[PDB]
Design a protein around this ligand. Structure first.
Ligand SMILES: [Zn+2]
Ligand SMILES: [Zn+2]
Ligand SMILES: [Zn+2]
Ligand SMILES: [Zn+2]
Ligand SMILES: [Zn+2]
Ligand SMILES: [Zn+2]
Lengths: 446, 446
């Protein structure tokens, strides 16, 4: 099964055939990309808010319009999927989902309301693909650049009526029925610890400082509970690299930041008439991204290495989180840098998947976002910014779907690409909940 | 070769698996959708400005979130392609293309600057897929809901330095080098008449009233020229239905409107805080759409019928034009109605293509647009409107990328779907210029 080695402009963009990405008929290559045998492993790469627009903006800036993302764009089977949520009261569709309801849709196969994690509109729990993979004996991984309490990673291990129920404190107040001291299963964090994935890497070390309100570990900080339960904790890249075992007996919990991990690129925020009144921006790397902080690609590589020791196979979800945050923040450079960041991780996954031959890799996003690529001389009512792309030309990005502090999500259907056994199931129009069924069947999960 | 007969939510959206669009593994069906034998015919359906956002908004409103477009969504092979244009002075990419440069890209295989038709950045002419198809002996059709002088349909038959050079008058002034009286090939309209496609259906009958400034038909209106050249003219649905022959000897020229043909649905324009201050809108069919005016689907069916008499095969380009116009106008109802209108036309093409067995059908857009689907309670800086969808729920659409009169195009890559021989060539990431080579090869054009 081949991966598109190169879909970049073949030559001089100004000449006939120069901007072509294909070099011949693709029929045969596509025939070789189709396989229905079981998938032994599954790596799900999620770019939060990485719609088609976000991918194009990132490509234009970092690789050039005629460029090609060695990871994101290398997947052969492509399609578009819907991610509408449901209104809790009416059961009718809610065209623009949040990160919680969408994550639940692909992790459980059931639609839900905005803000929900692992439960339907009737607040009923549903087993996640991770819980199922684990029950079947497969190694499980949950990686992300955001706080592990964040919607995307949480959705695979917690079941709460509200994404806001991070630790004991918030839970008791906002999620009474889930409150441990009220007979519930506990907060997102407490449930994360219970779920016991083999590898869990992300940020949000601050929340682990809270103390449990009940149970065996009442009075103990969640960090202490983690230690007492057998979790091997790592907080930097050096220690992460020293890890050799990651199993049910010695599960790994990496906390590399108080909150979300540092953004890769710095750049100013978009501004009213920014492409007109202000000079073009060139993004600069974040001096604080550190050498002590592992990159998304590094975390992915480690998770793969450790999870691959399991004879049964593994399920790994990797999230390029900050694309969504920086999109909300209307910060082009942050948004793009996180997309480039994700690309690298996709590459690692594709490299392993190609050698192993029985790995289904899927790259997609939970929902679309605000950013739009508009003409240079655009006078928009929102925030805009002009950037100096790799092409030596200027690209203007716009965010104008909110007068408030944060730019909002959008409902547009978006790309989903895959590679390996059962990838055909992402082609054409599909729903986000179909992804749950695709992964479960590919893994023969039962 | 099968077409997705149903990719709608299989059941109760609120229950597990209820929102799924798939009923089983798609590997086999996809393997049956792959074929490399020659395509005897080609039907290219273009939705002007019909990006992924536009398609979703139209589906949500007309069919429901869990709904399915029997035409637009029925195509099995899908992917995403780029449509950046070029800066005339520098040769560097211009991330947001106009309707002219994009149409030129797929019709000639060479990128060009915004505003150009059938020429590269050095203003050099390049033969179009239509001119080539004709030269090879195939029947050719050029259908659209806009004026035939419009960029999309014009791109297949005219070569001018500016899309503004509609008739003799504008040409002499804006395109000196193309002006007939100055030794050029003539205006867009004059060149259309020379090109002599077998079937050409659209609007823009007004422009045909201008008089030629030179040549054999100097002093004669372009309409009279058409008649003297042997073109059989029709101006309504009754007469269009009476047509039995459409060939090089008796080519058909249908002009069904002074300008662009009537919009299918009426509704108010989006407005500032419209989803807040104003009531939800239910689109209403345009009373003036008429029974005397053929619909896009009717024109398509006639073109296929007449073009299918040709033993060699045919090339037909059909355009759902007003999607773009109504998008500029920030009129949700007009935008969606035109997408529903195009869906019907895609259905007729799919039906024929399925029976014939050797027809490559392609449905795509020249570039993305402004409209975004945002949350109901959104307070946006632009124009917004709440709509009553088929789901009995409300969807809010937003346009906020321009403070000026018209909302602008956007640079995001967008969907391209195909069906039939050589459809595999649209899968994955590709460039718009690749479509030229795909069609030429599929047709074995030489
Ligand atoms: Zn999200
Ligand atoms: Zn996220
Ligand atoms: Zn978000
Ligand atoms: Zn256009
Ligand atoms: Zn058009
Ligand atoms: Zn336009």
């Amino acid at each position: 099964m081949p991966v598109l080695e190169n879909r970049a402009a073949q030559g001089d963009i100004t000449a006939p055939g120069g901007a072509r990405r294909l070099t011949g008929d693709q029929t045969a290559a596509l025939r070789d990309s189709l396989s229905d045998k079981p998938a032994k492993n599954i790596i799900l790469l999620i770019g939060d808010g990485m719609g088609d627009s976000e991918i194009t903006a990132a490509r234009n800036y970092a690789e050039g319009a005629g460029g090609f993302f060695k990871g994101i764009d290398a997947l052969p089977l492509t399609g578009q999927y819907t991610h509408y949520a449901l209104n809790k009261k009416t059961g009718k569709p809610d065209y623009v989902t949040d990160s919680a309801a969408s994550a639940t849709a692909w992790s459980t196969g059931v639609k839900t309301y905005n803000g929900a994690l692992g439960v339907d509109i009737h607040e009923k729990d549903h087993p996640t693909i991770l819980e199922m993979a684990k029950a079947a004996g497969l190694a499980t991984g949950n990686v992300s650049t955001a706080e592990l309490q964040h919607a995307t990673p949480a959705a695979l291990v917690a079941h709460v009526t509200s994404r806001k129920c991070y630790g004991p404190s918030a839970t008791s107040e906002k999620c009474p029925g889930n409150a441990l001291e009220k007979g519930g299963k506990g907060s997102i964090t407490e449930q994360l610890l219970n779920a016991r994935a083999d590898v869990t890497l992300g940020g949000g070390a601050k929340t682990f400082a809270e103390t449990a309100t009940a149970g065996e570990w009442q009075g103990k900080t969640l960090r202490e509970q983690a230690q007492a339960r057998g979790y091997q904790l790592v907080s930097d890249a050096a220690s992460l690299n020293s890890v050799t075992e990651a199993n049910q007996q010695k599960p790994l919990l990496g906390l590399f930041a108080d909150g979300n991990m540092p953004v890769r690129w710095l750049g100013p925020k978009a501004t009213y008439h920014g492409n007109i009144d202000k000079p073009a921006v060139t993004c600069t790397p974040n001096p604080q991204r550190n050498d002590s902080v592992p990159t998304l690609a590094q975390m992915t590589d480690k998770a793969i290495e450790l999870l691959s020791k399991n004879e049964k196979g593994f399920f790994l979800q990797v999230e390029g989180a900050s694309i969504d945050h920086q999109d909300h923040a209307a910060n082009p450079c942050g948004q793009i840098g996180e997309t480039v960041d994700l690309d690298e991780a996709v590459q690692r996954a594709l490299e392993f998947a190609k050698k192993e031959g029985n790995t289904l890799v899927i790259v997609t996003a939970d929902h679309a976002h605000a950013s739009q690529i508009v003409a240079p001389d655009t006078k928009a009512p929102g925030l805009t910014q002009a950037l100096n792309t790799k092409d030596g030309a200027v690209m203007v990005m716009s965010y104008g779907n909110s007068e408030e502090d944060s730019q909002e999500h959008t409902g547009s259907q978006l790309r989903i690409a895959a590679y390996g056994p059962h990838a055909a199931n992402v082609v054409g129009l599909t729903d986000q909940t179909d992804l749950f069924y695709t992964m479960k069947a590919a893994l023969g999960l039962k």
